[PDB]
Design a protein around this ligand. Structure first.
Ligand code: ZN
Lengths: 82, 50, 46, 87, 408, 171
């Protein structure tokens, strides 16, 4: 499944949003370097949400197809609706 | 952690990276109230919690 | 040390010693009640 | 006492009288001892098996009755009262 | 059967191992030779046997010890000699010290009785075949063939050996089966002079196998049958749970050490000083572990147990370990990569570097919005107290400066 | 026997290092991890030469850490039974001789020494010698020994050697 032709949805799913936000928040809580200006922000979840809106989360989503192959999408390559 | 488990907006435990639990009910020695970055504090549920 | 109990029948106070069976010395009744505490009891009148 | 009996909870036993029983009129709270009872072992030679007030409940001892049961063993019943204001 | 081990049900000799002497079915009594139980204090005071039974309720039974005629002579008791046996208080005692006595068959136990090794020492064919062991065929038409123990049994093992270039399985009994191993291979001894030990064999003599113990570079010759092949390492599990691996102990009040190695007879306990000293099971007595303590370090920072530290100075250099026990001026480090001393060594604490009286009293709240209320203190810190209020069914926290104890 | 083999190792990374120097801390931890270890299947690991590739790490749910499969080429020293190698005598006593082959230590038993050699407690430096004294082996000597056994202890294989065959002696 060459990422030349990724055939899955170009929109981030709601499940991907939920899990990416949680995982990044846990990383921030464990002193991972932050990717945006924190100005007056302290809650790891709020920081993770800021990073998501800025398209700065350093995470790749690996989507498995039923056939067994997978596609890798950078969190910044997907369209975030909600 | 200074407030402890009796003043409501307080905390019940300190868990160190070693994994050992420090019980804040049986008021412990002030050396065991020390917090550093690895630790976690089991704080009381407060406003805005999900 | 005294441990005064009230007899349920004849209402007689009488000493009782731990390990001593329960029995009124006057009437032989086997039910006794403890006396009210001497500790300070204070109520708000609410 | 904590020198002889072993399994003593951290609850105070000073509310008990010398007969091992609480007296009427004493305020009590959850996890407070109201009947002190020990069983001799086969912190030495005695295991605490006291009766504690139910957790989360509170009240004042109303009356304390002492008798013998059918087989002649000492037997006590303790009534605890709790005023309930509608809320 | 004659010369068999049995036990007793009731009486003062109960739970005492015994050996049979003769059995008389007609009389329903059997003779058991066992270690006598005689009280020396009774002989000194010269008490009658009947009196001892009258007051037996509060009297402790005597222990087990070999009979001595000289001991009673000093105590003044009368000792009589009847040939080989000796008569004392209407009982026949052997010269060695064993006690011969007759008891009813019903009282004696003759089923499910098994003596212990320690018990046998005081009183003083088999096969060892286990799955996964290579065995040879010493006798029979097919000689000089080595096979693996696929099956097991009792008197007739009936193993299914797998010989070289032989898929099929043969049939051989226990006596025909023999235990043989090739040179330079792991071998384990279940029974022997030093049982539960592992070593490698440089050669295999016809009947005297030679191996070298990992514990010490010394020869150990044992019967080949008692030998076994086991790729698994020697567990070295202790007997009775007297101590545990990596446990602090107090050999002497000044010196405290941690047991790093476990053996059948000896112990190799690592003391604070760092040297290795050998001791026995009985002499070493357990010491509790300091679940909480304090110490000092070069950096002048607090150090507790279970912290990763580096030995930048001291007996060891550039060494990393985990603290398991702490001493005033010493600390015990733990590891898994260190071969020497079972992975546990000791270094100085300083050289290591980072890598209630009011409870239960009755109080009156004398200030604040709860002034006048009265309660019992359930918990007090140095500044604040928990007061169960007599009137409100609530326990509140109150600054201790607002309390006055009510006196009787 | 020294060998050059490619092995694989998964290194766990705390989110603390999810910074610009992440790939570097990955290899730093690999070096700290594998180097100096010993294993029965691959023998001693002497050094890490290169790192073939770092796989994409994975985020393990709930846990903060990220795991990386790091395939790496390393030098390993594995002896074998029936192998003749050079060794360095480090201590000599009446019981026998103790030698070293790289990290491994070896002990030569009396049954592995030719009959001509005999123990001599009287000598000041204990040594193995025969009456002719054609060949003398003492501490720091170079010997050629045949490996007769392998025994693994606390993730550290130890071997027993032999010099009983012809042409094995101080050259
Ligand atoms: Zn009465």
């Amino acid at each position: 499944q060459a990422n030349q032709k990724r055939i899955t949805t170009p929109y981030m799913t709601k499940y991907e949003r939920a899990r990416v936000l949680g995982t990044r928040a846990l990383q921030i809580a464990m002193c991972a370097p932050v990717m945006v200006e924190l100005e007056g922000e302290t809650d790891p979840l709020l920081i993770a949400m800021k990073e998501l809106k800025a398209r700065k989360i350093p995470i790749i989503i690996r989507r498995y197809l039923p056939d067994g192959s997978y596609e890798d999408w950078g969190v910044d390559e997907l369209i975030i609706s909600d | 952690v200074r407030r402890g488990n009796s003043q409501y907006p307080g905390a019940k435990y300190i868990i160190r990276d070693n994994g050992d639990r420090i019980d804040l009910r049986f008021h412990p020695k002030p050396s065991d109230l020390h917090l550093q970055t690895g630790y976690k504090v089991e704080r009381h549920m407060c406003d805005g919690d999900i | 040390q005294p441990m005064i109990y009230i007899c349920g029948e004849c209402h007689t106070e009488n000493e009782i010693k731990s390990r001593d069976p329960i029995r009124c010395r006057e009437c032989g009744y086997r039910i006794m009640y403890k006396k009210r505490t001497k500790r300070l009891v204070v109520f708000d009148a609410r | 006492t904590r020198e002889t009996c072993q399994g003593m909870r951290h609850a105070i036993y000073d509310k008990l009288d010398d007969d091992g029983l609480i007296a009427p009129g004493v305020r009590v709270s959850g996890d407070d001892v109201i009947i002190g009872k020990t069983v001799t072992l086969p912190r030495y030679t005695k295991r605490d098996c006291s009766t504690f007030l139910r957790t989360s409940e509170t009240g004042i001892v109303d009356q304390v009755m002492v008798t013998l049961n059918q087989e002649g063993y000492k037997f006590c019943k303790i009534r605890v009262r709790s005023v309930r204001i509608p809320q | 059967k004659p010369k068999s081990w049995v036990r007793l049900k009731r009486g003062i000799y109960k739970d005492d191992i015994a050996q049979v002497d003769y059995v008389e079915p007609s009389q329903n009594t059997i003779s058991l030779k066992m270690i006598p139980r005689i009280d020396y204090d009774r002989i000194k005071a010269r008490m009658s046997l009947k009196d001892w039974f009258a007051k037996r309720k509060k009297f402790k039974r005597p222990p087990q010890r070999l009979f001595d005629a000289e001991k009673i002579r000093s105590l003044g008791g009368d000792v009589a000699s009847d040939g080989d046996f000796l008569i004392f208080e209407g009982n026949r005692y052997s010269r060695k010290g064993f006690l011969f006595k007759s008891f009813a068959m019903s009282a004696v136990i003759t089923e499910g009785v098994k003596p212990t090794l320690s018990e046998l020492e005081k009183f003083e064919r088999e096969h060892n075949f286990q799955p996964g062991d290579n065995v040879e065929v010493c006798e029979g038409e097919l000689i000089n063939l080595q096979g693996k123990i696929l099956s097991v049994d009792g008197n007739k093992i009936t193993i299914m050996p797998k010989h070289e270039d032989l898929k099929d399985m043969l049939e051989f009994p226990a006596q025909e089966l023999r235990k043989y191993f090739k040179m330079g291979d792991h071998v384990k001894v279940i029974a022997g002079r030093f049982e539960g030990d592992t070593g490698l064999i440089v050669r295999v003599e016809e009947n005297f196998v030679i191996l070298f113990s990992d514990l010490t570079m010394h020869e150990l010759k044992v019967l080949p049958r008692d030998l076994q092949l086991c790729s698994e390492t020697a567990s070295g599990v202790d007997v009775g749970g007297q101590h545990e691996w990596g446990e602090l102990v107090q050999l002497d009040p000044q010196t405290v050490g941690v047991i790093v190695r476990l053996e059948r007879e000896t112990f190799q306990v690592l003391n604070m000083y760092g040297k290795v000293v050998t001791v026995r099971h009985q002499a070493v007595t357990r010491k509790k572990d300091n679940r909480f303590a304090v110490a000092l370090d070069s950096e002048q920072n607090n150090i507790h147990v279970k912290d990763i530290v580096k030995v930048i100075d001291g007996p060891h250099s550039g060494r990393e370990g985990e603290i398991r026990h702490l001493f005033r001026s010493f600390a015990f480090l733990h590891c898994k990569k260190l071969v020497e001393n079972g992975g546990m060594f000791v270094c100085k604490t300083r050289h290591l570097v980072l890598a209630n009286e009011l409870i239960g009293q009755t109080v009156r709240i004398s200030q604040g919005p709860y002034k006048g209320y009265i309660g019992v203190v359930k918990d007090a810190t140095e500044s604040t107290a928990r007061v169960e209020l007599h009137s409100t069914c609530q326990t509140i926290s109150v600054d201790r400066q607002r309390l006055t104890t009510v006196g009787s | 026997m020294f060998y050059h083999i490619s092995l694989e190792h998964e290194i766990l990374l705390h989110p603390r290092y999810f910074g610009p120097n992440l790939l570097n801390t990955v290899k730093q931890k690999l070096f700290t991890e594998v180097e100096g270890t010993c294993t029965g299947k691959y023998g001693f690991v002497i050094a890490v030469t290169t790192i073939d590739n770092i796989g994409a790490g994975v985020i393990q749910p709930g846990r903060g850490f990220v795991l990386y499969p790091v395939k790496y080429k390393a030098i390993v020293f594995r002896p074998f039974k029936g192998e003749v190698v050079d060794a360095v005598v480090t201590q000599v006593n009446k019981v026998g001789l103790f030698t070293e082959i790289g990290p491994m230590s070896c002990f030569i038993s009396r049954h592995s020494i030719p009959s001509e050699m005999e123990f001599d407690p009287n000598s000041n430096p204990p040594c193995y010698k025969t009456m002719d004294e054609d060949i003398v082996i003492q501490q720091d000597d170079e010997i050629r020994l045949k490996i007769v056994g392998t025994r693994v202890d606390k993730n550290d294989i130890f071997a027993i050697g032999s010099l009983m065959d012809d042409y094995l002696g101080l050259v």
